[PDB]
């Protein structure tokens, strides 16, 4: 398994055992993600929310041929310390899944 995030937490994940990579822009993160995808092996990739809000949009055609790989968005270093409310993610996901967007 691997992760693309800020360089400080990337080496922490490498200490934890994940092939972490440091990045600060969307283009390099997407290019390295699609570099990791093409080869068979680990199917789990974690990306910070500051690099790729929609991980499926980058490999949308490779995902159409195989839905097996798992891509998980995650909070960054600065995002974690400032914090947020996770209800917006649910509010977006319900629109993504059933379209009616409404969830009280």
């Amino acid at each position: 398994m691997a992760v693309i995030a800020d360089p400080e937490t990337a080496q922490g994940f490498r200490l934890a055992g994940l092939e972490g990579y440091g990045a600060s822009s969307a283009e390099e993160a997407q290019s390295l993600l699609e570099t990791l995808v093409e080869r068979g092996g680990y199917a789990l990739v974690a990306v910070d929310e500051a690099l790729l809000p929609d991980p499926e949009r980058a490999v949308e055609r490779l995902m159409r041929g195989r839905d097996l790989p798992v891509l998980l968005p995650i909070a960054g270093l600065k995002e974690a310390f400032q914090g947020h409310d996770v209800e917006g993610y649910m509010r977006e996901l319900v629109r993504k899944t059933i379209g009616f967007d409404i969830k009280l």
Partner: protein, 155 residues
Amino acid sequence: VSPTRMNLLQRRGQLRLAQKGVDLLKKKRDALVAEFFGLVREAMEARKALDQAAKEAYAALLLAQAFDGPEVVAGAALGVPPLEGVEAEVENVWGSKVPRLKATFPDGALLSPVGTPAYTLEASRAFRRYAEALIRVANTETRLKKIGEEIKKTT
């Protein structure tokens, strides 16, 4: 179809079967939505648990970098083997199979497992708890994203 009385009765039977099938499919869709509205709550809970886990992992990592310095961590970090015992099993959900992920690397495989540096050991502890808690979010979200397509197919 040639017009006969027998064909008329056959067509009316087909109409009755179609109406019964529609009435059954609506119940199936209702059951799927009922499961979905609890799976989404479980995903919501796991998402905010992962936030606290990540935050207290990052705090320990930053303190280990600051006080103990980069060199104490890099004494082991320059040669850490990655995780390779990744589980790739599958489990059924309403007629489709979805995977669950797990690792089985041991604890003391890395160089110097002794906890002489306190902050470097605490960072690894918090990161271990982080890694063990992430699979909940992963499994719940990948189940939710398939229930959401089963509902769409039924509709």
